Amino acid sequence: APADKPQVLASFTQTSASSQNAWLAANRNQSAWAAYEFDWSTDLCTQAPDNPFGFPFNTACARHDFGYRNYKAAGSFDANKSRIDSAFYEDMKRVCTGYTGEKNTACNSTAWTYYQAVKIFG
Numbered sequence: 001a002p003a004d005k006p007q008v009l010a011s012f013t014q015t016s017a018s019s020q021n022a023w024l025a026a027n028r029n030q031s032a033w034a035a036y037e038f039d040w041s042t043d044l045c046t047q048a049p050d051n052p053f054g055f056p057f058n059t060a061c062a063r064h065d066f067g068y069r070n071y072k073a074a075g076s077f078d079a080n081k082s083r084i085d086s087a088f089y090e091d092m093k094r095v096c097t098g099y100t101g102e103k104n105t106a107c108n109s110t111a112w113t114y115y116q117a118v119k120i121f122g
């Protein structure tokens with residue numbers, strides 16, 4: 001791997017919207033990143049808590065799998081887990097931003113439930 005792989009990896013897994021956006025753009029052109037041999041696989045929100053209202057969290061689950069799979073392969077999952085879990089929560093709250101009134105509250109409550117599940121069983 002290239003010697004700046006750790007920096008790149010860190011840049012795609014911060015909690016901010018610009019880090020989420022940098023990752024989406026790279027996910028869209030995986031081929032430009034082949035030299036880095038990242039694991040791009042994802043099972044979306046499989047094995048997550050129930051989502052009766054259908055809030056669309058698949059993109060957030062995807063970036064969360066990217067942080068877990070790639071930090072485990074780098075041998076530094078324990079030291080970075082909690083950031084990846086928090087970035088997951090921030091991605092989900094950015095989804096909930098498009099709902100208002102009670103729906104926002106319901107979205108936020110499902111997002112917290114997802115966050116807590118990875119925080120505890122991750």
Ligand SMILES: [Ca+2]
Nearest residue numbers: 043044045065
């Ligand atoms: Ca997953």
